[PDB]
Amino acid sequence: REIVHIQAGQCGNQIGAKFWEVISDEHGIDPTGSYHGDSDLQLERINVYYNEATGNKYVPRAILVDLEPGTMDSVRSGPFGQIFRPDNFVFGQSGAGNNWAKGHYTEGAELVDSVLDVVRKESESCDCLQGFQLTHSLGGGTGSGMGTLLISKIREEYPDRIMNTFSVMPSPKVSDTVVEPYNATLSVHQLVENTDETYCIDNEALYDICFRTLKLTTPTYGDLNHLVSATMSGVTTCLRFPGQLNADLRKLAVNMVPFPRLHFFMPGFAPLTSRGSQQYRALTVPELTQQMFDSKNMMAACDPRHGRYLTVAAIFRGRMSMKEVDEQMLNVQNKNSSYFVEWIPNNVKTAVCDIPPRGLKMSATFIGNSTAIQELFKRISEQFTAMFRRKAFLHWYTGEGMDEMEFTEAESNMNDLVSEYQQYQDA
Amino acid sequence: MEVIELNKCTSGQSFEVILKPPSDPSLEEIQKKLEAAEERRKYQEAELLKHLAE
Amino acid sequence: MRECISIHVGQAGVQIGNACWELYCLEHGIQPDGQMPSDKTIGGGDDSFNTFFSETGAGKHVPRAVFVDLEPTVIDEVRTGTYRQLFHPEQLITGKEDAANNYARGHYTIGKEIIDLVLDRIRKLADQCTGLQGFLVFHSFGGGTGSGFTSLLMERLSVDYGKKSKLEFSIYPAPQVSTAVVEPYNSILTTHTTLEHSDCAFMVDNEAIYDICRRNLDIERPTYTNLNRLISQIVSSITASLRFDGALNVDLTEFQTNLVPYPRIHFPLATYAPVISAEKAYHEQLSVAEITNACFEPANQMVKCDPRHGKYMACCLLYRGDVVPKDVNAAIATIKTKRSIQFVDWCPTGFKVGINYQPPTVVPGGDLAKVQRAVCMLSNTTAIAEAWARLDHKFDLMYAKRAFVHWYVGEGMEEGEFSEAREDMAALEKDYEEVGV
Amino acid sequence: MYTFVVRDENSSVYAEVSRLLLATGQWKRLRKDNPRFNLMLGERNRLPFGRLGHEPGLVQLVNYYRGADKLCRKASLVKLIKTSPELSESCTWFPESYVIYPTDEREVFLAAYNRRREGREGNVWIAKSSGILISSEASELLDFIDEQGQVHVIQKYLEKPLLLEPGHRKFDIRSWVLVDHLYNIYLYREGVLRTSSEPYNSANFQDKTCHLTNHCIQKEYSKNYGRYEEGNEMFFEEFNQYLMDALNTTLENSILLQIKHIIRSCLMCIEPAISTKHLHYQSFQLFGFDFMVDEELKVWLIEVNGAPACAQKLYAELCQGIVDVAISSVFPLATSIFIKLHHHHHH
Ligand SMILES: *[C@H]1[C@@H](C)[C@H]2[C@@H]([C@H](O)[C@H]3[C@H]4[C@H]([C@H](OC(C)=O)[C@H](OC(C)=O)[C@@]32C)[C@]2(C)[C@H](C[C@@H]3O[C@@H]3[C@@H]2OC(C)=O)C(=O)[C@@H]4O)[C@]2(C)[C@@]1(O)OC(=O)[C@@]2(C)O
Ligand SMILES: Nc1nc2c(ncn2[C@@H]2O[C@H](COP(=O)(O)OP(=O)(O)OP(=O)(O)O)[C@@H](O)[C@H]2O)c(=O)[nH]1
Ligand SMILES: Nc1ncnc2c1ncn2[C@@H]1O[C@H](COP(=O)(O)OP(=O)(O)CP(=O)(O)O)[C@@H](O)[C@H]1O
Ligand SMILES: Nc1nc2c(ncn2[C@@H]2O[C@H](COP(=O)(O)OP(=O)(O)O)[C@@H](O)[C@H]2O)c(=O)[nH]1
Ligand SMILES: [Ca+2]
Ligand SMILES: [Mg+2]
Ligand SMILES: [Mg+2]
C-alpha cells in the first residue's frame, strides 16, 4: 500500500530531507540504503515509503522538486543525501522569487511535466498506490505556487487517490518577504479544493515553542525543522508500522474529515523539554497526555479553547501501559467534554506504537481537527487585506499575467472557509 | 413443571419444560442498484475532470 | 445429514472465524493438517461433524468455509498460520484495497467488482453438498467490508439460494476497541439492507465481551485475541447442536422455529457462564443452579441490557458437561421464584433444554479455565432493543449535521438511503416496544 | 470535578439539588444532551435508561428506578398488590380496590358491592386515576368512568377517618422516602399532614373541600384555608403533641410503625424487578407515600408518587439529604435526617 512523497521548494525540501533522515533511522535504513536494524517490525510496512532495489537496498519513494538547484544540491550533500534516487531530482534554474504566479503559471508551468513523469514512473511500480504526500511552504513561490499546481495535475491523473500535505504557514514573526500573505491565500484557495488532509504547520508556533518552551533565544530554520520532522514522524507512525487505527491515508481521512473542506489539522507533539537537569526526568503517561493536549505543544498558533474539536487522533509511542493510556485519554475527554462536539460521538481515537522515536523513551503526537484553526486563516486574511486594500506589491504578480480578480476570489473562498468553521463551532 | 419431548443419546439429552401455557430484490434489481451507483461515481468524476480542464 | 457453509467477511469475521475453526478442530479431534484419527469412514461420511467438514480421499477434513476480505493482510495470516493446511486456496478470497470503514465503498464500489467471484467460490462448496442447509455469516457492523459487502452478499444469497436459511454472527461496535467514528452509520445501513435476508442473528457487543474479559479473566486491556477466543466458545455452544448428536436445534430451520416467532425480531440474546480465569489458583466448581442463575445476570450477557424490563418470546438453555435434566429443572424452579421473567401472552412460559455431556473444550494456553459444566442461554427478549436505541441515537446526532455523509455519497450511494435505513430502524424499535411493553 | 445533566426543568426538588451540587464547586452542569456525565437528573416520561451505563471511564447514576412506575400508577399499584404474594389480595393496609376500564374487574367489583349494601354496612366508593368521583351508587361510579374515557380504579372509600379537633377535619399524611443505589430505604424524619379546613360531612359526598385533602383544592374552594395552620400543613411536632394531648398516645406508636411497615413492604416487593445492584448503571429515587388514618388509628396506603414535590418548609433539609446519601455516597466530595428502614425477623 504505497505512498508517493513529494517535496517542493526550499522549505519543502529542507523539512523533507529531515523527515527521511528521521524515519530512515526508525526503520533501520542507513544513508546507503542498507537495513541494519534488529526488528522485523521495522520492515513489515517499509514498502509504504521505500522501494526495494537490487542488492536488497531501500530507496525512498520520494521526488525532490525546486525551480532553483541550490537547496537540492545541499540535500544531495546532506547526511542521507545519497539515499534518494538521483533520477527523482527534478529542478530548474530560474527560481520563483517568492512569487506564487511564477511557481504556478510561468516558471513552474515549464517544469511541471518533468515532475509528473517521475511521479508516473514511481506510481507504476506500486502494487496498490494509496496516495501522495507533499511537503512545502505556502509563503514562497515554488513550494506554494508550483506545489499547488502539481497537486492539481496529480488530481487530474489520479482522481481517486488521497492527497495529503504538510503545509508550512507563513508568519511575520518568522518571515522572508512581505508578499507571504498573498502567496499563502492563493495557496489555501487551492488546498481547500484539492487535498484530503492538510497538516497546518505554523512558523509562528514553531518559533514560540523554540523561544518560550525550549528556551532558544535565536532559533534557526534548522531548529524549527527538528520540531516538524519529529511531528511528521509521529503523525505517520500509523502508516509505517503495524496497527489497527488510521493505518492508511483513506481511513484516516474518513475518521478525521466530517466535511470535505474542513480538512486542516493542528498537529502537536510531546514531550518538548528544554535542556538541563529535567531533560533526563522520566515522563509518566498522565504527563504525556496533558502535554500533548497543551496549546503550547501545538504546531499551529491557535488556541484550542477558542473552538471545539470535531475529531482527534492521538498516537503514543514507546513501552507503556495501554490501560493507563486509555484511562488518561478518557480523562481528558470527560474532564473537558465541552470542547469536543457532542454531535460526533466518540470522536477521539488513540493508537499506541511500541517503537519510540530517537532520543525519547516515550512520546505522543496529537492531530486535531479544531474549529479554532479559523484563527490561523483569519490572521492570513487580515495580513492579505492590509496590502490588497492598496494593491501593494501586486505588480510582481500582474507581471506574470495574473489579474486582480484572482486575488479577490482566493480571499473570498478563504473567508468562506473561516465562516464554515464558525458555523460548526456554534452548532 | 411439565417436562416433554425428552430425547436421550450417548452424547447427551434434550427436553422442554413448560412452566405455564400462553393466552426480495431480484438479480436484475440488484444489478440495477450497483450500476446506478457506478454511474453516479462516473458522473462525479467527469464533473471534476471538466472543472480541472477549465 | 445436511451441510452448513460458513462465510467470514472482513477482519472481524475472518479473525473470529479463525478462533471458531481452531476450537472446532480441538472439539472434534481434527489436527492442523486436517487428519481425524477417530474418523473410521475414510474419504467420506454423513456423520454430524460432516455438517461443517468435508472429507478428501486422503482423509483430510476440510472446513465448509469461505474467507473474504477486501484487503489481504488478515487472510494472509490464515494462509501462513498454524491451520494453513486445513483450507484450500480457493476458500480464501482477498482484494487489493479495503472499504476504508465505508459501507458505501464496500457495498457499491468494491462490492460490485468482487461479488461474482465470491459467489463462484461459494458455489464450488455448495456443489459438494448433497443437502445444503444454508449459511452462517460472520462479520462486523462497523467495518466497511463487514457492513457493506456482507449486505450485498446476503441479498445475492437470497437470490441464488432462495430456500436456504441464513444465520448471522454480528459484532456490534464499542468505542473501547472500535477503529472508526462512522461505525454507527455502517451498522444501521447494513442492518437495514440485511434485515429481510437474515433468519436469525446473534449480536455480540464488543463492550460486553471487553468487560467480561477485564472482570472475569483479569485481563487489564483485552486484545482481539482475548475477545475472539471467548466469542468462539459462545459460537461453538450455539453450533454444537449442528455438529454433534442430539434432538434440539439440529438444523438451521429449527433455530428460527425455536427462537424467532416474529421474523423481523430475530436477534436472540446470548448469555454465557461460567467464564473463569485459567490463572485462578483456587476455583470452587459451580453447580447447575449457579451457572443457570448466572444466565439472568446482565454482566454475563453478550449485549448489556435489562431483560427484566422487556418480555421473552423464547428461551433455550444449552449445557455442556456434567448436567442432568433433574438438576436443570430444579434450578429453573427456584430461579423463577426469585427473578423477573415475563413472557409475551402469545408464547408459552418455558425453556427448551439441550445437554451435551462433553464439557467445554478450551484452547491450550488460553485465558479460559476448564470447567465441569457450562451453559449458553439463547433468549429472544425485547430488551436487546436497547442496543438499537443506543445505535440510532448516535446515528441521529451525526446525521442531523450530515457529518461524514459526503464519504458515502462520493461512492455513489444516494443520501436518501441514510434516512430510509434510519426509518426502518425506527420501525424496528417500534416493533420491539409493541411486543415488549 | 463530577458532571451532571438536568433533563426535568419542572422539578422543584432537583432544581434545588442542582443548585446545591453547583454550590459545592465540585460539580459541573453539562448541556442537556452531553453524554459524558456522572449524574442524570432525568425526565419523568420515557427516560432513556437504555443509553445509561455505556460510557467508559464514567460511573453513571440516575435519579429514577426503571420499573418503579408499577408502584406509582393508580391501576398498576392495585394489580401489584393483588398479584404479589408478598402483599396479596388479603392485604390489611390497602383499601379494597378494583381496576376498571371504559367501554378489567367490573363484574368482580359488583359482586363485592352487593353484599356490602346487603349487609347493613357502609358502601361508599371512590373512582380515580393518575377527575374524581365519590359515590354510594355503583351505577353512578361505572357511568362516570366511561364518560371520562380513561383507565380507572374504583376504591373503597374510608368512611370513618381520623378527624382533627378543632374543626372535625380530614387529612392525609405525606411521607418522603429515599431509596439509594444499594437499595437502602431511607424514611425522611419529617412528614406532613395535608389538612382539610372544612368539617367532614358524611351526609354530602360532594364539597371536595372536606373530602379531598389535596393542597391545591383546599386553596381554591375552601373558605377556611390557612385558618388552623399555615398552608393547611400540619407537621409532626404539632400532630404528635395533638395525639398525646387528645388521644393519650404518640405518632411513633399509633401511626409511624404502620407507615414504616407499609413502605418497607412495598419497596422490598419490587426490589428484584428494579434493583441496580449488579447493573452497568445505578439508580436512586425519591418517593412520596400518601397515607390515610381511620378513627381506630389504623393506617391505610392511598398512593405512591414517583415524582414528589416537597413542603416549602422542608425543601432545604431534604434536598441536602438527597445530595448526602444518594449522590455523595457514589461521588464523594473532597445526626442523619433519615430513618433507615430494615427488619430481619427469623421464622
Ligand atoms: C538547533 C538546536 C536547537 C538543535 C540542534 C540539534 O539537532 C537538536 C537536538 C534536540 C534539541 O532540543 C532541545 C535543545 O531541547 C535541539 O533541537 C531543538 C531545540 O529543536 C537541538 C540541539 C534534542 C536534544 C534531540 C534529542 C532529544 O529530543 C530532544 C531534543 O529534541 C527535541 C525533540 O526537543 C536532539 O538530540 C537533537 O539533535 C541543531 C543542530 C541546531 O543546532 O540546528 C539544527 O539544525 C538542529 C536542530 O539539528
Ligand atoms: N470482536 C472482534 N471485533 C473486531 C475484530 N476485528 C475488528 N473488530 C471490530 O470490527 C469493527 C471494524 O470492522 P472491521 O471488521 O475491522 O473492518 P472490515 O470488515 O475489514 O472493513 P474495512 O476494513 O473497512 O474494509 C470495529 O468495531 C472493531 O472493534 C476482531 O478480531 N474481534
Ligand atoms: N379510599 C379513600 N378513602 C378516603 N379518602 C380518599 C381515598 N382515596 C383518596 N382519598 C382522598 O382523596 C385525596 C386524593 O386522592 P389521590 O391520592 O388520588 O390524589 P393525588 O393523586 O393527587 C395525591 P398526590 O398529589 O400525592 O399524587 C386523598 O388525599 C384523600 O384525601
Ligand atoms: N520551517 C521552515 N520554514 C521555511 C524554511 N525555509 C523557508 N521557510 C518559510 O517558507 C516561506 C518561504 O518559502 P520558500 O520555501 O523559501 O520559497 P520556495 O523555495 O519558492 O518554495 C517563508 O514563509 C519562510 O518562513 C525552513 O527551512 N523551515
Ligand atoms: Ca468420515
Ligand atoms: Mg526561500
Ligand atoms: Mg479491513
Numbering used by the authors:
A (entry chain B): 2 to 42, 45 to 360, 369 to 438
B (entry chain E): 6 to 28, 44 to 74
C (entry chain A): 1 to 437
D (entry chain F): 1 to 103, 126 to 152, 159 to 362, 372 to 384
Sentences from the paper on this structure:
Microtubules are dynamic structures consisting of αβ-tubulin heterodimers that assemble into protofilaments in a head-to-tail fashion, and the straight and parallel protofilaments interact laterally to form the microtubule hollow cylinder. Tubulin heterodimers contain two GTP-binding sites, termed N-site (non-exchangeable) and E-site (exchangeable). GTP bound at the E-site makes tubulin dimer more prone to polymerization, while tubulin dimer with GDP bound at the E-site tends to depolymerize. The taccalonolides, a newly identified class of MSAs isolated from plants of the genus Tacca, have a distinct structure and microtubule-stabilizing manner compared to other microtubule stabilizers, and, most importantly, have shown the ability to circumvent taxane resistance.
To determine the exact residue on β-tubulin to which AJ binds covalently, we used crystals of a protein complex composed of two αβ-tubulin heterodimers, the stathmin-like protein RB3 and tubulin tyrosine ligase (T2R–TTL)1215, and solved the tubulin-bound AJ structure at 2.05 Å resolution. The taccalonolide AJ bound within the taxane site, which is located at the microtubule lumen. AJ formed hydrogen bonds with β-tubulin D226, H229, T276 and R278, and a weak hydrogen bond with K19 (3.7 Å). Most importantly, using its C22–C23 epoxide group, AJ covalently bound to the carboxyl group of βD226 side chain, consistent with the reported mass spectrometry data. We then propose another reaction mechanism for it, in which the activation of AJ C22–C23 epoxide by protonation is followed by two interesterification processes, eventually leading to the relative stable tubulin–AJ ester bond. In the tubulin–AJ structure reported here, the covalently bound AJ pushes the M-loop outward to form an open conformation. Another conformational change of the β-tubulin M-loop is that it forms a short helix, similar to that in the tubulin–Zampa and tubulin–EpoA complex structures. First, AJ was bound to both β-tubulin subunits in the T2R–TTL complex, while Zampa or EpoA only occupied one binding site. Second, a GTP molecule instead of GDP was found in the E-site of one β-subunit. In the T2R–TTL complex, the middle β-subunit (chain B) is in a situation mimicking the β-tubulin within a curved protofilament, thus hydrolysis of GTP at this site is significantly accelerated and likely has happened before we add AJ into the crystals.
